[model samples]
Target chain A: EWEALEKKLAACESKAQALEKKLQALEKKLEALEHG
Target chain B: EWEALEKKLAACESKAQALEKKLQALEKKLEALEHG
Candidate 1:
């Protein structure tokens, strides 16, 4: 019954993970900028 | 050198986190609408 919702929930989480990766990259760049 | 930007970089991530939660909620509602 809720399989579709669960599937979509997983997809949303995947998007969240993608955003997290982008955030991590920006964070690293900021660390580099800090020491430069 | 770019510590100022580093500080702002964190701010942006925090903003992103807020947006992410809101977006997930939106996605959840949209998903429900689809199967309702």
Candidate 2:
């Protein structure tokens, strides 16, 4: 049925975004540490 | 970074494949239920 679904699919998107952000931050930190 | 990476990328691929198959089956079932 195409009725209202209560499941939280956005959780998956949020988790993916969090991982991406963490990876980016880590890379930036690594570069800064290496250059400093 | 031209060397081998120890990460298990295949594990993620395997999980994605399993989810894909489950989604396909659910879609097929929904279509069949709607038609029947």
TM-score winner among the candidates? Answer: 1
Ten residues in sequence with the least summed lDDT for candidate 1 chain A: A1-10
lDDT of 2 at B15: 49
lDDT of 2 at B7: 31
TM-score of 1: 0.46
The CA lDDT at A26 in model 1 is: 52
* lDDT per residue as tens, model 1, A1-36: 256545645665676688777657655655555676
Which candidate has the highest DockQ of all? 1
lDDT of 1 at B5: 51
The CAPRI category of model 1 is incorrect
RMSD of each: 19.1, 22.3
* CA error at residue A7 for candidate 2, angstroms: 26
After superposition, candidate 1 runs with Cα above 4 Å error: B1-36
Q: How much lDDT does candidate 2 score?
A: 0.48
Scored against the true structure, residue B17 in model 1 reaches a CA lDDT of 72
B1-36 in candidate 2: lDDT tens per residue?
112211333444454576566557555655655676
